[PDB]
């Protein structure tokens, strides 16, 4: 039971990923997309926030032929901490 669900790379360039997760039945206030190079992950990453009304994002400025780990978090404006059980995937290039 992850929140959100079904994270996948929809489309990719050598330097950019187009990701999507389930626009769900039960909505949240925001999402935080985190990403980093696998092997340095989870100790080094970059991140950005999107509203809960969104279920897609682009991660750009990446390098070709590199393994990346991407984790999406869900959150509430009424909590400092993210919801437990985020969802995570790997993708190279």
């Amino acid at each position: 039971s992850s929140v959100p669900t079904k994270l996948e790379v929809v489309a990719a360039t050598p330097t950019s990923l187009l990701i999507s997760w389930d626009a769900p039945a039960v909505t949240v206030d925001y999402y935080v997309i985190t990403y980093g190079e696998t092997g340095y992950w989870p100790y080094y990453w970059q991140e950005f926030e999107v509203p809960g009304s969104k279920s897609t994002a682009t991660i750009s400025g990446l390098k070709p032929g590199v393994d990346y780990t991407i984790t999406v978090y869900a959150g509430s404006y009424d909590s400092y901490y993210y919801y437990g059980s985020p969802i995570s995937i790997n993708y190279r290039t």
């Binding site: 935080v32 190079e37 100790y43 080094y44 950005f48 400092y80 985020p86």
Partner: protein, 114 residues
């Protein structure tokens, strides 16, 4: 609770989201400016946020570092270990932390809580 308490340090901001941190390091920080804040994914754990770019909206780019406390010592996932975050911070002003995400990670000026 299991490592030296760094909450009295001036570069410690406590509750501060990644978006808030990015705004701070942008509006007042330079390249290599850093702050420590509490993790939002791991309660009680710390995050070192480092400005690593000027540009990417009119916001700057921040790389984030997970701080691990294990067996009374601090590290950033590997390599050297420190009795305090203050010692860790000083070491990574003089030494590079890592090269990742197309940027060389090294500390410069702390961004202090106001």
């Amino acid at each position: 609770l299991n490592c030296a308490d760094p909450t009295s340090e001036r570069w410690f901001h406590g509750h501060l989201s990644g978006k808030e941190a990015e705004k701070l390091l942008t509006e007042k920080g330079k390249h290599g400016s850093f702050l420590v804040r509490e993790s939002q994914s791991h309660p009680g754990d710390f995050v070192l946020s480092v400005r690593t770019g000027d540009d990417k909206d009119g916001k700057s780019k921040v790389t984030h570092v997970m701080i691990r406390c294990q067996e009374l010592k601090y590290d950033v996932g590997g390599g050297e270990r420190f009795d305090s975050l203050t010692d860790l911070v000083e070491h990574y002003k003089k030494n590079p932390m890592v090269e990742t995400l197309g940027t060389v990670l090294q500390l410069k000026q702390p961004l202090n809580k106001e």
